[PDB]
Amino acid sequence: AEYQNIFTQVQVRGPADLGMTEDVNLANRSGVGPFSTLLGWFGNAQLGPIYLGSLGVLSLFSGLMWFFTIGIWFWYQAGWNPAVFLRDLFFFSLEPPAPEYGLSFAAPLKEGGLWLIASFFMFVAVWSWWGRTYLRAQALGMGKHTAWAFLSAIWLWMVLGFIRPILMGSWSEAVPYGIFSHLDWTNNFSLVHGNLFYNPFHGLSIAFLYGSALLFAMHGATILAVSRFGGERELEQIADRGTAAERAALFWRWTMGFNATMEGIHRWAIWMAVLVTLTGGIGILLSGTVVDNWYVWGQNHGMAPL
Amino acid sequence: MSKFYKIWMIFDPRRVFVAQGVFLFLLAVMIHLILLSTPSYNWLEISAAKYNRV
Amino acid sequence: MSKFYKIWMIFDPRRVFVAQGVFLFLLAVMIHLILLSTPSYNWLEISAAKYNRV
Amino acid sequence: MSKFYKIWMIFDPRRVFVAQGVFLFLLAVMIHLILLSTPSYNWLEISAAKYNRV
Amino acid sequence: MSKFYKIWMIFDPRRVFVAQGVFLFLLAVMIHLILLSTPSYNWLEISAAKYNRV
Amino acid sequence: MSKFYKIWMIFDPRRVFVAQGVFLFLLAVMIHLILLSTPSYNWLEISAAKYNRV
Amino acid sequence: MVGVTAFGNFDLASLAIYSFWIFLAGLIYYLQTENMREGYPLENEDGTPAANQGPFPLPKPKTFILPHGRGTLTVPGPESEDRPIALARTAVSEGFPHAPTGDPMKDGVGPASWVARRDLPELDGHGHNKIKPMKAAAGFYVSAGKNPIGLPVRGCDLEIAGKVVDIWVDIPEQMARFLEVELKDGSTRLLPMQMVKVQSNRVHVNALSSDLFAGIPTIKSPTEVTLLEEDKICGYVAGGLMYAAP
Amino acid sequence: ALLSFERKYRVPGGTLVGGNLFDFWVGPFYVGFFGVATFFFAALGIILIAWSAVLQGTWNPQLISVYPPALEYGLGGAPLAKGGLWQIITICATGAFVSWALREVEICRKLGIGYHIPFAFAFAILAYLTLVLFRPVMMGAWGYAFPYGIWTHLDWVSNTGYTYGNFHYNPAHMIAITFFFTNALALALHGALVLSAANPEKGKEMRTPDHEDTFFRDLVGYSIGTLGIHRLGLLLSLSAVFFSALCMIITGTIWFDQWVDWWQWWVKLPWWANIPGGING
Amino acid sequence: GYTGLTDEQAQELHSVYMSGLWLFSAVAIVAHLAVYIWRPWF
Amino acid sequence: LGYTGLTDEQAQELHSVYMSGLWLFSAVAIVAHLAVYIWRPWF
Amino acid sequence: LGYTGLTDEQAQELHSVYMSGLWLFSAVAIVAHLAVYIWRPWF
Amino acid sequence: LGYTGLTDEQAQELHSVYMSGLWLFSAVAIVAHLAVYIWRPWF
Amino acid sequence: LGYTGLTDEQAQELHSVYMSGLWLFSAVAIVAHLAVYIWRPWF
Amino acid sequence: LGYTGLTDEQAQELHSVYMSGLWLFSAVAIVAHLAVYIWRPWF
Amino acid sequence: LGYTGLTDEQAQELHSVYMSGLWLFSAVAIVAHLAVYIWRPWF
Ligand code: BCL
Ligand SMILES: CC[C@H]1c2cc3[nH]c4c(c3C)C(=O)[C@H](C(=O)OC)c4c3nc(cc4[nH]c(cc(n2)[C@@H]1C)c(C(C)=O)c4C)[C@@H](C)[C@@H]3CCC(=O)OC/C=C(\C)CCC[C@H](C)CCC[C@H](C)CCCC(C)C
Ligand SMILES: COC(C)(C)C/C=C/C(C)=C/C=C/C(C)=C/C=C/C(C)=C/C=C/C=C(C)/C=C/C=C(\C)CC/C=C(\C)CCC=C(C)C
Ligand SMILES: COC(C)(C)C/C=C/C(C)=C/C=C/C(C)=C/C=C/C(C)=C/C=C/C=C(C)/C=C/C=C(\C)CC/C=C(\C)CCC=C(C)C
Ligand SMILES: COC(C)(C)C/C=C/C(C)=C/C=C/C(C)=C/C=C/C(C)=C/C=C/C=C(C)/C=C/C=C(\C)CC/C=C(\C)CCC=C(C)C
Ligand SMILES: COC(C)(C)C/C=C/C(C)=C/C=C/C(C)=C/C=C/C(C)=C/C=C/C=C(C)/C=C/C=C(\C)CC/C=C(\C)CCC=C(C)C
Ligand SMILES: COC(C)(C)C/C=C/C(C)=C/C=C/C(C)=C/C=C/C(C)=C/C=C/C=C(C)/C=C/C=C(\C)CC/C=C(\C)CCC=C(C)C
Ligand SMILES: COC(C)(C)C/C=C/C(C)=C/C=C/C(C)=C/C=C/C(C)=C/C=C\C=C(C)\C=C\C=C(/C)CC/C=C(\C)CCC=C(C)C
Ligand SMILES: CCCCCCCCCCCCO[C@@H]1O[C@H](CO)[C@@H](O[C@H]2O[C@H](CO)[C@@H](O)[C@H](O)[C@H]2O)[C@H](O)[C@H]1O
Ligand SMILES: CCCCCCCCCCCC[N+](C)(C)[O-]
Ligand SMILES: [Fe+3]
């Protein structure tokens, strides 16, 4: 049979890689954890070390409180029964306050008060993690592309839970903390605004979710195809172009009529993924605030018969 | 009950002050937000009823 | 019992105190939230009923 | 029977002490949650009926 | 209590000011948001009804 | 408050000025949109009602 | 502010959807011109610049500094396939294949092509060699999988071509790169791991047949492989799927 | 019009059909045997969509739709104005996709690279063939396939989804959606991580894959590697499409009722079906 | 010898480990005795 | 032994101070529980 | 200290200009608020 | 011990400053609780 | 002598500038609360 | 036989201690079953 | 101060031209606002 380079047939293990200390505070960085043979069949086997500094403490402890607050509400909702908690785990939900309160913070802890407490913990945990994502790149002297790409996903996160509920004047517009609960919110959000399919930015946002899936299947298959020429090390292909980068480019040149470079394909990748949540934030922020029926708005804008 | 000053010979002062500062901030807001949630201690609503406001 | 001092010779003092500190706070937050949920011990509501604040 | 100390020539004391502490606390909270769920042992709700607080 | 100046030999000034500046802005916005949310302290509405504008 | 000039020996002028420009502009646009939303202070509507342009 | 339109039906949602078309057009211009930093300007079938260069202008040069005093790479810049391309065109007109003027695998054309890269080893962040034999790397062992050392190497013609002597490993990535295989001639050649199939009792190389291992390009140092040697070895072996499976 | 390094790669060979009959390049495109087939099928299907517009009476591209034959025709042929044109365009699209996948195989052989790309494209083709061919054939009529309109193929999705209630509750849908979200998240991380290494802070040396591992170990405590991330990206998308086609080949052929009711098998397990409390008890 | 202890080190360690174990059970017995008086389960 | 690097003399100093905080913590807990039981007993 | 590379005189030079703009920007803001409060007070 | 390198002189000087702020923070909290209890008790 | 490479006299000066800005920020806040409380008390 | 690095003496004393623990565990099991059978017999 | 390399003579020359354009653009804006205000004032 023919080797398709999808699983490593042979694993080689040596000293634990402790990383490089460009400007990293080496005190905060922990020690190397275990080695996973199962993960070694697909990628690296080494787990850790992890940098837990000042924004790591703030993010992990706030993220713990957000996670633990929702858990205790689920134990209360289960009547403190371990079996009932297991049974109805996907049905429990922590919900925002009723629309009668608007944006006011005077809602009882059982009627959207714990939601505000959990939401604050999530606000601190997510935003602190963006700062940690920024600062971890800075200590290694690397570009901030990870921080700014993450900021695109935070944009949709802030539109769903904070920005739009402020603009709509009530916390009841926000997303409940549950598994089946936030699926119902998604289904009902479309029905209230008249078939969200006809939102132009939801349509664009889907174009880049399919485009990301299309692009990573293309890029991942291209690299594994030219991995026989040392194509996986894309960083050294950028510095000194080799036969892997030339065959990868000439495949898509002969197929599509245009191609990319080894570095330029990762600009397509980052820009295709950030538009998924950048466009989604606008479409969500326009729903109800500017358009309260996307099928009727569509009818006036082509897109649908009169 | 006096040799607690040795704890700064074991624990990094920078990490301890940061964790303690994070803990108090999160704790203070949670208690303040609880008091707002309880209608009997919401000091904004209490004054509204007392002084005949909205 | 008098030889319990050798636990530190096994466990890192730095790791034990972190694990214990997070443990106690979540244990204490859990217990308060259980009393808060139960109407018989919600001291915020018990005081309101006593002093006619609602 | 008076030779059980030799288990510690087999198992690392650090992994046993961590695993045991996780096990016992998880076991203890599980039993306390079983008693809270059963209404004939809910000591929070048993006391409410006895002193007629509700 | 007059030795708090020694905190600057521990924490880097470039990091404290950024941490402090972010915190004070978000605290000010958070309190201003609470006041606007409650109709008793929404000053834009208070003047609107005081001068009979709407 | 006479030694504030030394803050520039800590923070790069390029990063401070850009950060303020984003902050000051976003702050002003936020407040202008907050006023434009409230019907009492919407200066475009006030002129129409005052001059009977509708 | 539902239904508020500046003109016609152009509301705030129309301003947003039309602003995105302009932003997307600017982004596609940027993303495409950032991908013209290699392989441009376009050439004719013989080497001269073509009369058509496309709608998109070339970008402006950027300098890449190299991480171990290896120089500054500026793209786009002067380019040349620094090697003797041994091909003769099959037609006077353009768009037709070029036939090799001899042995294609040795001459380095077609699917057996190689690029004249920097003739130095690739370095990790510590400045050492990224790839080195496992018996020289310290502490490296085969943690899982069939240890493919001492197994015979069978070619695509189902004839044995040698047996594995060592494994060349990527030190920072911690993955196997090449198999060093000793031939009946007594010499050693490198075979990329992606091109081998390690079975339970042998290593099968579908690309080359038995009487082609002696033609794999060799390495100037027993414990050090350079980018030029990697490209010749990888290009030669993978070029046998087309020119060496008759 | 060749790339500066393209002359040594244009060699004759690696053609499944022909060998010199259709072995040439028209501009940058490779015209294989299946390039001739792909162009004919791509061109015919487009002009049929243009022709179906004049039968529909519209020129707005967002209103043009080609509808499948009505449910009264079953699985046979149909008149051209009703649904016969859809069947020709579906055949033309099916021919163009398979020829495009087959044409990519000839390009892989001529460059001597692996066949990962054509294999991954066949997953898209199989998902498409599931929606227009396999699933309608099981259900019994061509009228269950989606129409060929920009905004009317969304109406097919919405109408089909709400036939079974909220489609979020399809268990294979949830798995597929998870793979799609993970694939886009990993694509943002992969592009950003490589770009930050190639474009460091300022006046700094280009970083190394040792900085790429270190960044993600500092961040999330693990790093899948440079080879692992590309295997993962390929497998996340193929998995996303596999469970996409899985969730629709079981909808209306095996499962017929609301997808919410499926999850009552868990909530009605015998050992906790009767315990009072919670949401369902 | 997997953990690298000596024979007397295991003797010393296990003596303390049992010392804590009987301390834990002594509280557990008192805890279980107190509950049985308050509310028996048998 | 000595996984953490603490000597026997250093471990005694650490444990002695650790118990001092433990007993201080529980004494507050005992007074707190005694105050609650007098206020609203649960048994 | 001195993490920016500016000398002592440069920080004096930069601050004097920054404060000039700050007072100039604030002076307009105060007049802007003074006009608005006269036209339509919010208190 | 010796995990951070702070001497006894440094540890005593660090603890003395830190414990000074602890009583300053605890005194403000005690006054705040006393003030709130007079205004609106919870027991 | 420290964790940040700052001499004691450097720390003495930096803290004095900081506390100067903190009294200024605090004093302006006290005026704001005092004006708001007289305008519309929250107690 | 090998396969682990044990010896005849090492396996015998390992079995002696292990099997003694097996009887100790079964000693509790018999007593517990006997008490349950007195309380609520299932036979 | 060499963040960009302007030699204090280009910056003076550059800033003179920028202010010349700045005043011209402000001059046209003032005329436009005076024209709109006389047309229909917004105050
Ligand atoms: C019936 C329901 C409606 C519908 C209602 C909605 C609603 C409502 C929304 C979407 C949105 C989207 N829809 Mg839709 N959608 C429908 C039909 C579809 C169909 C289809 C084939 O029919 C598809 C493919 C899609 C796909 C999409 C995406 C393009 C888009 C989601 C982007 C995203 O990744 O957000 C997911 C990513 C985020 C939300 C960002 C999260 C990042 C945060 C900061 C990270 C937090 C981590 C957290 C703390 C956990 C930590 C864990 C530990 C770290 C381990 N929809 C139908 C018509 N859809 C969203 C959108 O924006 O579109 C406009 C959206 O709000
Ligand atoms: C399976 C994983 C993902 C994937 C992978 C993937 N796609 C691929 C490939 C791969 C690996 C290619 O190699 C191939 C390629 O070359 O890409 C540039 C391709 C490709 N995927 C494409 C599109 C595409 N992929 C999609 C999805 C996905 N592709 C998956 C999510 C989608 C979605 C979700 O909508 C689209 C639109 C093309 C860019 C390209 C294949 C081009 C092709 O087939 O060329 C020949 C055919 C034509 C030129 C057009 C023929 C037109 C018909 C005759 C008429 C119209 C028929 C059509 C059904 C009408 C639709 C109407 C409405 C529904 C709008
Ligand atoms: C839901 O349940 C609720 C929340 C309602 C109930 C739950 C309540 C719980 C669990 C409460 C838990 C409370 C706890 C654990 C409180 C602990 C509080 C503590 C320990 C506060 C300590 C504060 C100490 C402070 C603020 C000290 C500050 C010191 C300074 C500011 C000085 C710093 C300067 C220094 C150190 C310079 C010295 C440097 C040199 C070099 C000498
Ligand atoms: C759902 O079920 C419920 C929750 C209702 C019931 C379940 C309840 C359960 C399972 C409860 C479990 C409780 C347990 C196991 C509690 C254990 C508590 C412990 C062990 C508390 C110990 C506290 C000790 C403390 C706080 C000691 C603090 C000491 C210091 C702060 C001093 C610092 C140390 C110094 C200074 C050492 C210095 C010396 C040197 C050499 C540096
Ligand atoms: C919903 O919440 C609302 C919005 C209602 C309430 C929230 C209110 C909040 C949080 C308000 C916060 C307000 C703040 C933080 C205001 C702070 C304003 C400040 C500090 C403004 C300072 C402005 C200073 C400026 C604009 C100075 C500019 C200086 C120049 C233009 C001069 C140019 C400088 C040069 C040339 C230096 C160059 C270097 C040399 C050597 C010459
Ligand atoms: C659904 O079906 C139902 C449940 C209704 C009925 C089905 C019941 C079934 C299928 C039950 C199956 C039961 C079985 C197979 C039970 C087997 C039980 C056994 C064999 C338990 C053995 C326990 C052994 C123990 C606890 C041994 C402990 C040993 C020690 C504590 C000594 C410690 C070991 C040391 C110190 C190693 C010595 C080291 C050196 C170096 C000498
Ligand atoms: C919804 O919210 C509303 C809109 C209602 C409220 C929002 C209000 C806001 C955000 C107001 C903000 C207003 C601001 C900040 C306005 C700023 C305006 C400025 C700064 C205008 C400046 C114009 C300057 C110009 C046009 C200068 C042009 C110069 C030239 C055309 C000449 C070019 C000269 C060169 C290049 C010099 C070359 C010299 C050398 C030696 C090379
Ligand atoms: C046995 O289990 C234990 C108890 C140990 C732990 C178990 C925990 C469990 C079961 C956790 C379950 C967690 C789940 C199901 C989480 C689901 C989360 C979901 C689906 C979230 C989806 C969307 C959430 C969003 C979009 C949140 C957005 C929030 C913001 C954008 C910021 C919100 C901040 C606000 C609203 C204002 C806060 C400000 C103040 C001043 C309160
Ligand atoms: C491609 C990127 C660049 C786009 C062009 C650059 C300018 C961007 C702004 C264009 C705004 C004008 O866009 C134009 O708006 C009017 C406003 O109702 C639309 O509306 C007009 O046609 C529609 C559709 O028949 C009618 O329902 C409507 O009654 C009529 O007024 C036009 O259909 C649209 O073409
Ligand atoms: C759906 C089209 C399938 C065509 C597959 C490609 C052809 C395979 C056989 C090629 C070799 C044939 N032949 C006669 C030379 O042996
Ligand atoms: Fe890549």
UniProtKB/TrEMBL annotation, chain I:
Keywords, alphabetical: Antenna complex, Bacteriochlorophyll, Cell inner membrane, Cell membrane, Chlorophyll, Chromophore, Light-harvesting polypeptide, Magnesium, Membrane, Metal-binding, Transmembrane, Transmembrane helix
DNA-binding in keyword set: no
Chain segments annotated as transmembrane: 16-38
One Pfam family cited in the UniProt record for this chain: LHC
One Gene Ontology molecular-function label: bacteriochlorophyll binding
Compartments it resides in: Cell inner membrane
Keyword hit for Nucleus: no
Gene Ontology BP term (one): photosynthesis, light reaction
Binding site for a bacteriochlorophyll: 14, 32
GO CC entries: plasma membrane; plasma membrane light-harvesting complex
Membrane topology designation: Single-pass type II membrane protein
InterPro entries hit by this protein: Antenna_a/b (IPR000066), Antenna_beta_CS (IPR023623), Antenna_beta_dom_sf (IPR023624), LHB-1/5 (IPR002362), Light-harvesting_complex (IPR035889)
UniProt domain Antenna complex alpha/beta subunit: residue ranges: 7-42
Domain of life the protein comes from: Bacteria
Function: Antenna complexes are light-harvesting systems, which transfer the excitation energy to the reaction centers.
NCBIfam families xrefs: pufB_517_ASD
Family: Belongs to the antenna complex beta subunit family.
Subunit comment: The core complex is formed by different alpha and beta chains, binding bacteriochlorophyll molecules, and arranged most probably in tetrameric structures disposed around the reaction center. The non-pigmented gamma chains may constitute additional components.
Protein name listed in UniProt: Antenna pigment protein beta chain
Organism in which the protein naturally occurs: Cereibacter sphaeroides
TrEMBL record, chains J, K, L, M, N, O:
Keyword Nucleotidyltransferase on entry: no
Listed SUPFAM superfamilies: Light-harvesting complex subunits (SSF56918)
Keywords of the record: Antenna complex, Bacteriochlorophyll, Cell inner membrane, Cell membrane, Chlorophyll, Chromophore, Light-harvesting polypeptide, Magnesium, Membrane, Metal-binding, Transmembrane, Transmembrane helix
GO annotations of cellular component type: plasma membrane; plasma membrane light-harvesting complex
BP terms from Gene Ontology: photosynthesis, light reaction
Domain Antenna complex alpha/beta subunit: 8-43
Record's bilayer topology term: Single-pass type II membrane protein
Binding site for a bacteriochlorophyll: 15, 33
GO MF term (any one): bacteriochlorophyll binding
Subcellular localization(s) per the UniProt record: Cell inner membrane
Regions that span the bilayer: 17-39
Superkingdom of source: Bacteria
Subunit structure: The core complex is formed by different alpha and beta chains, binding bacteriochlorophyll molecules, and arranged most probably in tetrameric structures disposed around the reaction center. The non-pigmented gamma chains may constitute additional components.
Role description: Antenna complexes are light-harvesting systems, which transfer the excitation energy to the reaction centers.
Assigned protein family: Belongs to the antenna complex beta subunit family.
Annotated protein name in UniProt: Antenna pigment protein beta chain
